[PDB]
Symmetry: C3
Subunit: 82 residues, 3 copies
């Protein structure tokens, strides 16, 4: 009877040691994870799609402007020609 109890205590102590090692590993893993407070949220961050769309609108206007300037320069050259 006593021997059987001793063997159960042995198994329990082994299980506990294993659990302690699991916990030690878990703590290390947690320390590698990012905190919610330190990570910029989707709400806060600009997406490539959004930026691309607004950049495209600007680019089209710049292209329009460049064409207008070229046309104007040609008109002026025509006006000033002898």
């Amino acid at each position: 009877g006593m021997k059987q109890i001793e063997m159960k205590i042995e198994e329990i102590l082994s299980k506990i040691y294993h659990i302690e090692n699991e916990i030690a590993r878990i703590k290390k893993l947690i320390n590698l994870k990012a905190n919610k407070a330190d990570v910029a949220t989707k709400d806060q961050l600009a997406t490539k799609t959004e930026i691309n769309s607004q950049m495209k609108q600007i680019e089209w206007k710049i292209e329009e402007i460049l064409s207008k300037i070229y046309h104007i320069e040609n008109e002026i050259a025509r006006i000033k020609k002898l």
Copy 2:
């Protein structure tokens, strides 16, 4: 009765250990759903909507100014003709 008491304590201990093992299994799954520090952007690397809006606005104002100058010039040229 001494042996019986020890057995009852062992029963409760084993139940507690089993519960802890199940908790640990659940924790490991939860950890796997969390983002690693190494896999995210470092503080202030990424562009915010506020910053982008401000930057775009400055460019937009300049473009609008330019378009106004062009319209005026086109009118001046039409008058010169």
Copy 3:
């Protein structure tokens, strides 16, 4: 004395278990403060400040060129008059 020794081992085991339970409780709280993979924006979707700054600078250079062309044209028109 055999019984006494077992009883002492049980005392230590119960103390160890209580300590482990407290550790687990703390770990669960710590995990709840960590960011989820599902809630973090992907590399595919995000823009960096460096990338944006470079693109904005290229636009600024084009605007500077445009302004020089406009200024020149305004001067040409003033001369024509």
